[PDB]
Amino acid sequence: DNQFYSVEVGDSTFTVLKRYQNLKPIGSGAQGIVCAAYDAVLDRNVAIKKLSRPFQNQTHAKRAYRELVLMKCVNHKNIISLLNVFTPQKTLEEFQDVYLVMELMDANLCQVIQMELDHERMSYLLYQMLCGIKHLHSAGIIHRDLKPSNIVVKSDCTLKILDFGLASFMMTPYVVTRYYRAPEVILGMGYKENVDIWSVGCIMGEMVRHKILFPGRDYIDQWNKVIEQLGTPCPEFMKKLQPTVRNYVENRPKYAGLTFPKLFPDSLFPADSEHNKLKASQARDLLSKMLVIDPAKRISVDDALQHPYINVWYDREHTIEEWKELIYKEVMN
Ligand SMILES: CC(C)(C)n1cc(-c2ccnc(NCCCNS(=O)(=O)c3ccc(O)cc3)c2)c(-c2cccc(O)c2)n1
């Protein structure tokens, strides 16, 4: 009469409560594998993410502990919330895996980027991105690593963020996606709230261009990509850079950088209607303000919420045994 039951989805086995039914794998992530499921008690479809051995790696333990506490303490329409968290194990010594259950989203943000989008839906998704980020900054947390895959979207166009961002050796085949990190992050510079606006910029720019704006195998490669299109930073930005970092940047060959109408041509935006001609004007303008290498020139989230394109929609270190106990107490208050 165990309330849990074990099923194998993908290679790994999933042990879940009886309430969850017809498990199917929607995706796989480093922290854990995710399955779509139906809740007999809820009568609604849900997504279940399995964290296996979050305690085995200190980096995994810090992320796992932070995710559990944050999903509970913070609740926002644009931030994914956990409906339930369970572990099949019955004691602290037996505990090995943690299962997080949340609301099932229809698609990933990457998929939305691929389709050709209308300004209203685009401005709405971006608006929601700023709202969640604004809530995060209100909570004192700066994501610093917004990525399309971490942003889930629904058929009705509602957008939700999956993770709370960076807080570091890990030993796996999975590779981080750094395309959407800001220059202050790429150059290890000291950050601020509007470090996430750059990520929103890379995303908004990828929706228009339908390609990753600054894709690079390494931070150096990516920094070359950012300076080519954007242009070499100003001297004031250099003075802000530490000397060892400043030397590298100034040694980089200088690029004049394309112009934003040249970066995002008028053709990429729809020109069918006067309203769409104006929207593209408002869109290209917002892009120019968000994709700014210097954070002092970059636009604030609030000002981006005020922007006409966006405005219309508005109405610690522990031992692995210590980490296991910390995570276990989070699973069971
Ligand atoms: C990192 C972690 C573990 C926190 N995480 C949490 C989630 C998560 C949470 C809530 N809802 C979702 N579902 C919508 C996107 C799924 N992709 S889908 O192939 O289009 C698809 C959609 C519906 C379907 O029935 C069959 C396939 C995902 C993901 C995740 C999984 C796959 C891709 C991805 O980008 C992210 N990762």
DSSP string, 1-33: --SEEEEE-SSSEEEEETTEEEEEEEEE-SSEE
In a domain, 328, yes or no: no
Protein residue with least CA distance to atom 33, ligand 1? 27
Contact 163, 210 (CB under 8 A): no
Distance CA 270, CA 119 (A): 9
In a domain, 327, yes or no: no
Known binding-site residues equal 26-34, 49
How far does residue 129's CA lie from ligand 1's centre (Å)? 17
**256 backbone dihedrals φ, ψ, rounded to 5°:** -70, -25
Strand 97-103 with 45-52, pairing: antiparallel
Protein residue with least CA distance to atom 19, ligand 1? 26
| Residue to probe by mutation, ligand 1, list 26, 52, 115, most atoms within 8 Å of CB | 26
Same domain, 150 and 219: yes
Same domain, 97 and 115: no
Protein residue with least CA distance to atom 2, ligand 1? 29
How far does residue 36's CA lie from ligand 1's centre (Å)? 8
Find the radius of gyration of the CA atoms of the chain.
21
Count up the domains in the chain and report the number.
2
In a domain, 322, yes or no: no
Same domain, 188 and 263: yes
* Closest to 253 (Cα-Cα) out of 229, 230, 216, 227: 227
Distance CA 303, CA 301 (A): 5
Contact 179, 268 (CB under 8 A): no
- As a whole number of angstroms, the longest Cα–Cα distance in the chain is 70
| Token pair listed for 290 | 């968000």
Percentages (nearest 5) of helix, strand, coil residues in the chain: 40, 15, 40
Q: Quickly tell me which residue has 């010594």 as its tokens.
A: 93
Q: Quickly tell me which residue has 């100034």 as its tokens.
A: 250
Protein residue with least CA distance to atom 21, ligand 1? 26
In a domain, 93, yes or no: yes
What is the residue range of 82's domain? 4-106
Beta strands in 71-190 (DSSP E): 82-86, 97-103, 107-108, 151-153, 159-161
| Token pair listed for 258 | 């394309």
Protein residue with least CA distance to atom 4, ligand 1? 162
Same domain, 68 and 171: no
Contact 110, 149 (CB under 8 A): yes
Neighbouring CB atoms inside 10 A of 212's CB total: 18
Neighbouring CB atoms inside 10 A of 214's CB total: 26
Same domain, 197 and 265: yes
Distance CA 95, CA 52 (A): 10
> In which element (H, E) is residue 323 found?
helix 320-331
Beta strands in 207-326 (DSSP E): none
Please give the number of the atom of ligand 1 that sits closest to the Cα of 148. Answer: 35
Same domain, 51 and 191: no
Distance CA 110, CA 89 (A): 35
Distance CA 330, CA 333 (A): 6
Same domain, 204 and 225: yes
* Closest to 193 (Cα-Cα) out of 301, 74, 293: 301
Same domain, 138 and 233: yes
Distance CA 128, CA 197 (A): 13
Known binding-site residues for ATP equal 26-34, 49
Contact 96, 89 (CB under 8 A): yes
Active site residue 294: no
Please give the number of the atom of ligand 1 that sits closest to the Cα of 102. Answer: 10
How far does residue 33's CA lie from ligand 1's centre (Å)? 10
Distance CA 71, CA 163 (A): 9
Please give the number of the atom of ligand 1 that sits closest to the Cα of 153. Answer: 14
- Among 80, 106, 132, residue at a domain's last position: 106
Same domain, 159 and 15: no
Same domain, 266 and 211: yes
How far does residue 123's CA lie from ligand 1's centre (Å)? 22
Q: Which residues contact 119 (CB under 8 A, 6 or more apart)?
A: 270, 276, 279, 280, 283, 309
Distance CA 222, CA 181 (A): 10
From the candidates 39, 145, 163, 196, give the one annotated as an active-site residue: 145
Report the half-sphere exposure of 161 (CA within 13 A, side-chain side).
32
| Token pair listed for 244 | 């060892």
- Among 106, 129, 144, residue at a domain's last position: 106
Q: Identify the bridge partners of residue 79 per DSSP, sorted by sequence position.
A: 76, 161
Same domain, 170 and 285: yes
Distance CA 75, CA 77 (A): 7
DSSP letter assigned to residue 40: T
Distance CA 301, CA 134 (A): 7
Q: Which residues contact 316 (CB under 8 A, 6 or more apart)?
A: 62
Q: Pocket residues for ligand 1 (CB within 6 Å)? A: 26-27, 29, 31-32, 34, 36, 47, 49, 102, 104-108, 111, 149, 152, 162
In a domain, 325, yes or no: no
Q: How far is CA 57 from CA 29, 60, 186, 317, in A?
A: 16, 5, 25, 11
| Token pair listed for 80 | 């994914």
Q: Is residue 268 helix, strand or coil? A: helix
Please give the number of the atom of ligand 1 that sits closest to the Cα of 49. Answer: 3
Q: What is the CATH number for 209?
A: 1.10.510.10
In a domain, 223, yes or no: yes
In a domain, 63, yes or no: yes
Q: What is the CATH number for 40?
A: 3.30.200.20
Same domain, 117 and 251: yes
Q: Is residue 120 helix, strand or coil? A: helix
Please give the span between the terminal C-alpha atoms of the chain, in angstroms, as a whole number: 24
Contact 214, 179 (CB under 8 A): yes
- Among 106, 126, 145, residue at a domain's last position: 106
How far does residue 152's CA lie from ligand 1's centre (Å)? 7
In a domain, 160, yes or no: yes
Which string of DSSP letters, residue by residue, matches 78-91? TB--EEEEE-S--S
